[PDB]
C-alpha cells in the first residue's frame, strides 16, 4: 500500500492529527449522557461531564467537518471504563469526563459509547482515511485514599468486570504504597503517587500481563496509535518491555507526553525519545515555536537553533509530534492576541519535520488559561474561518509533498523576524516564508532555493497576504517585499530516481517481524533492504512498491542496525540509523543488590551478555540504579527489559567518571521468565 | 603516519598553498639567469626574465620567510625545459619567464636552475615540512607557425634532448592542424589551438605514452602534487586516463584550472571535479569572494548561498582549491584600497572548507591589473605586515583543528554585512565572524554555538578588531559588538571516539593501489574499511592509526564504491561515497561512427559492458558525442578512457532525452591496446 495511505499505522509524518477532549467536542447520543451531580449541559462547569461522546465525532467526519480541513487523524480521550463518583476537591465536584481515571481497561466509558459504537468509530474513520490514535493511561487507575477506602472507588481495578483488587487492603501488592511525590527526583516521581491516583505496581505480575492484555485488546479493535501517558512517571525498563509487546504483535506509532517547560532541554527526556521505542509530544519544538510566535520571549535565531538542533538530538526527528498548545496549556490564542498569530503558527507547524497535532477548537480561535479553562466546549462548527482555511490548505500537503512529510530542513533567509526555509526530499521541495511583524514589511534580496525556474503560486492563495516567488535560473528568486504578518508557502513535486528512506516503523522488534521503510524511488521491482551488512531479498520482503516497503527483520543478533534500501538496479538509499532489534519477547525484571557503597558521584550500573544489558560494554550499562523508594542505599534497584525465557550472565559495576569498578567473582546468572516479571535480589562480590 | 604529516601526498585539506610564479620571486644565483634581450635584472618589463629560481626558494624556506608565515606547500612554476626565443608580439619582447612555452618535459627550465637544484628544492622542502606542487601543462608546447617554421621554436617537442618533431611539416601527426579555437563550443576549444600555441595530439600514441612517461619521472623526483592547466581544453576520456596513470602508479593530490566567471556557474565544470580523477581550482568560491569583500557586488546572502550551494555541488568540497586572486585575475589588493578588505578575505579564506592557496606577495600588498601586471617581483620580504601576521595566526589551525580542515560548514548569524559561520568536524568546532562594513559596528544578539559553555580568546588575538565571545548554556553566546572590519576566530578541540572519515585520496583506481584515508577517532587498533559491503581488514591494510589509514583496494568489479570505516570495537564511520574503483590500467581509444543521422536534440551515446562504458545503462552512456572538429556529422567521435588490453564489447545508440533508440545487431567487440591508444571507426547498424 502506499506510505500515505489509512492502513499505515506504523508510520505518521504524512498525516496531521485533530486531538479531540471527546466530552467536549459533540454530544451525538444524548442517551449516554451521565446524569445528576455528573453532568452539566451547559459546560458551563468544565470539571462536569458536557456529554461528547463517539457518536459525535461519527457525525463530524460524515458531514465533512473534519474531513474538510484536510484531518487524516483523530486523537481521542482514553477509552477505557472510568469511575463514575463525582469527587468533590475543596468544594468544586469533579467527574472523569477527561478519561484518565480509569477502573477497567477492557470495557469502554459508556458516557462515549459502547464497544459497537468504538467499532462505529474506527469503521467510519477508516472509510474516510482517517487514522484513530487513542490516550492509555497505565501508570494508574483513580482517585484512592488506602485510609479512607469510602474516598471515591478506592482506586479499584477491575478485568472485565471482575474485580481484581482496591487500594485499602491490598495484600496483592496491585498497588504502590510509598505516599505521594515531591516531584524531586525521576525515581521520586516514578514509584509515589502522583497527587491521589492510585499508582499501579507493575512489578506484580498480575498487573504486568493484565496492561499488555488489555492493549492488545484495544491493538485487535483496529487502533491505529497510542499516546500514553505519564511516560516520566512509569520505570523506564517496563516501558520498553511493554513497547516490545506490542511492536512484536501488532506494530502501530506510539508517542508520549514527557513534558518540558520553556527553556528546559532535558538529556533523559531525549535518551527516553531514542531508546524507548516510543516517540514524544515534541514539547522542545512547542515550547519555542510559542516563544517566538505568541509571547514574543525570543526571536527567529531561537526557532533557527531549535529547528538545527533538534534534528540532530533526536534520531528519529520525523516522529516527533508537534504542536503550538493542547490540554497541558493555555490554548496559545489570547484575548489581547493578534489572530496572526495563530494563523502563522498553525501553517509553521503544518509545513514543519514530525507528526502535526493541532488541538480541537483552535480553527475556532478558542481562548483559555490552564485546566480545565482549556477545555471549554467548542463554541461553533464554522467552516469559514481563516484559520479553518489554513488547514485545509496546508494540511493535504503533507500526504502529497514528501518534502514536507519527510524532508530536510534549510533555513534560506533570516532575521530578528523573518524566517524563510526550505524543506527537502530528494527532488521535492517546500518554501515557507513568515514574516512574524506585524507592523514591518521586510525587503527579502538574495534568496536562493532549491526549486527549479518558474512562476510559483502561494499555495495558501494569498490569505495570510503571501505572494508569487518568481524563481530564475540556479534557484534565485527575484527579489520581493514580505507584507507585515505575511506568511506563504511555495513547493515543488517529482519523482525521485534514488531510493531515499524518510521513516522506518517499529524501530525496535524481535526477528521475524514485518517493519515498514517509507519514502520515495523504491521502484516498482522488488530490490533488497540491508540490517547492517545483512541483506534480505525475495520472500522475506512481503511487500515493495515506490513509496513503501513492508519487510520481515531478519533473524541476526540483538543490537542496533542501520537500514538500506537497494533498489531492483542496485542503487542505495540513505542510511537510517539506530534500528535496535530484540533478542526476542521481553520480559521485565528488577534487579536488587545489597552492599554496592559508593563515593560522591559513583553509582551503580548493571551490564550483561545480551544486547538489552549492553553487551558487557560498561559505556551501554544499564542504570545508574535507584537506591531512595523501594529500596534504600546500600542497597539499590532497576527495572530492566530483558529477553524472556533465557539464561543471561551479567555483572554489576560502579561508574565513577570514567573509573568502572566490576565486582569480583565468577559472572552472575538468572534464567528470566516467559511472562510476568521477576526479581533478583544478590549481595555486591569483592 | 598522521594526516598531517608532509609525506601524506594524497590530500592537502590541511595545508595552506603558497602559489610562487618562480621567476618573479628570488633570485638565488645570478649565474642562471638568461642574458641580453631575455633578460631584465630590474623586473620593470614583466614579459622578460627577472631572475628568480630555486636556489632563492630554498633560502626563503631557510631563512624563515615561508615558514614563519605557516605556509605548508609550495606551488611553483612548470620545472620544465621552456623554448629560448624571445618573440616579439607587436614590438613588445616576451619570453618563457613563466614555464607555459614546453620543449622538453623530461628536462628543467635551467633559468629555474638544475636537476640537482630541483632535487635540492625538493629535499630542503620536505626538511621543513613543505610539500611541492608543479604546474604541468600538457595541453600544448609553445608558440608555432606552421606557415612560418622561423617564428619562435616553431612549438618543437623534444623527448630528452632528442627531437620528436615540429608543428611545420607534422608528418607523424604529432599535433592538432585544425586551425584556432573561437571558443564556442567545449569541442572547438579542445581541438583547435588556444591561441598560437601549438596544441599537442593526445590520440597519437606517441604524445600519449611520452607525456606519462614525463609525469611519471617528476613524480619519482619526489613531487608532492600537480595542478594541470587547461583542462577544459583536453579531452575528459584522455585526461582520465591521464590521471589513472598518476593514482594507479604513485598517487598524489592534482587539481585543474577551468576559468569560471562572476556568477558563471557551469555544470560541466562540477561534472569534470566529480568525474575526472582530479579536483579544481575554486573558482566559484574565488569570484563570490571578490564579490563581496573586494568589489561590493554581491553582500553575505550571496556568500551563504556559494557556501551551502558549493558543499552539494562538489562530490567532494574537501579537495577544491580556494583562493581570492592568483596570476589569471587583478590582484585582490587595490593601489590605494583599503588593506582591511584583503586582511579579511585572507581570514574568510584560511577558515574555510577545502585547500587554501595564497598568491604570493599577498601578504605584502601587492596590487596589479591583468597578466603581465598582477606578477611583478615580490617588493618586500617583511614578516610583520598585517597580512603576514594574520596567516601565521590562522594557517597552522588547519593542521590543528579538524573541523578547520575538514568540518562542514554551517550559517549561525547573517545579515547583508556580517556573517559568521561555524565549522565542525565531531566535537570539534570553530567560528568565525566576519563584518565587512569598515564603518558600521554590529550588535549581535542570538548567536547560538555549538562551543561548551566557556569564554574564547579571539585566535587573531584582537589584530583583525576581534573580541573575546563568552558563552553560555547551550552554545548561547552573550551579546556582543563586532567592531566596523571585525574578524575574530573562536575555537573548540577534543579528542574523537568514533570515526569520522574526512577526506579520500586517491578517489579513482584499481584494485591493488593503496588510498589514503583521513579523519579522526580511527584508534590505535585496526579495524574493518568496507569498499561497499566488502570488508577490508588485516594484512590489506598498509597503515592505521587514529587520524590516518592506508588501505589497498579489494579486488572489486570496476564501479563507484562507498567507503566505511569501523574500528576495532566496530563503532563506524560517515559514509564517504564516489569512490570509483577502475576495471584496470587505462587507455584512450577514439570510437567513431558514421552515419549516425540525428533529430531534434537527439544525440549518439556509447555503453558497453565495462563500468568505463556505464555498463550498458543508457543513462549512464558515454557522450553525447563529437560532430564538428575531427570528423563532421553524420560522423560522430568521441575519446574515452577504458580498461587496457582486453575485449570489451559495446554498441552505440541515440538518445532523444528519454527514449533510447538502440543500434540493431550483435554487440560490438574489440580488444584494447596495452598502451598508447586505438580508434574503432564503425557504421550505425539499424
Ligand atoms: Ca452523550
Ligand atoms: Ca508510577
Ligand atoms: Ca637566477
Ligand atoms: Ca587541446
Redesign the interface.
Known sequence: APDTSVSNKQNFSTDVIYQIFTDRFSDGNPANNPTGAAFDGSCTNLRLYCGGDWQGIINKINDGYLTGMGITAIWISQPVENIYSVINYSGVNNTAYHGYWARDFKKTNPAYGTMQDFKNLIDTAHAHNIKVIIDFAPNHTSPASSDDPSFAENGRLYDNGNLLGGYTNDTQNLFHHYGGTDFSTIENGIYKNLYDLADLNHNNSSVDVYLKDAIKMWLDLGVDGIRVDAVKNMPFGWQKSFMATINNYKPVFTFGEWFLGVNE?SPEYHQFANESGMSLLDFRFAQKARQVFRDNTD?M??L??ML??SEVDYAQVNDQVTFIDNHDMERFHTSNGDRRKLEQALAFTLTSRGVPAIYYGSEQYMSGGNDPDNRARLPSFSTTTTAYQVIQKLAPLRKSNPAIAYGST??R????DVIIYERKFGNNVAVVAINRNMNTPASI????TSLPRGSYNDVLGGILNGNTLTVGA?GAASNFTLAPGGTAVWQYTTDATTPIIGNVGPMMAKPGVTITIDGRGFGSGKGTV?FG?T?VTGADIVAWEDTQIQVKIPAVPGGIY?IRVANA?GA?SN?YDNFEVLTGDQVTVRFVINNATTALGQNVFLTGNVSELGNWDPNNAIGPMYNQVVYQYPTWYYDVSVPAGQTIEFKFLKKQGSTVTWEGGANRTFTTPTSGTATVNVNWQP
Open positions: 532541554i526571536n535565531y531561537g533557527k537553533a538545527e538542533g534549510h533555513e533567509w533570516i532575521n530578528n534580496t538574495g534568496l536562493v540556479g540491508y551488512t541483506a542501520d538496479a542505495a542510511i
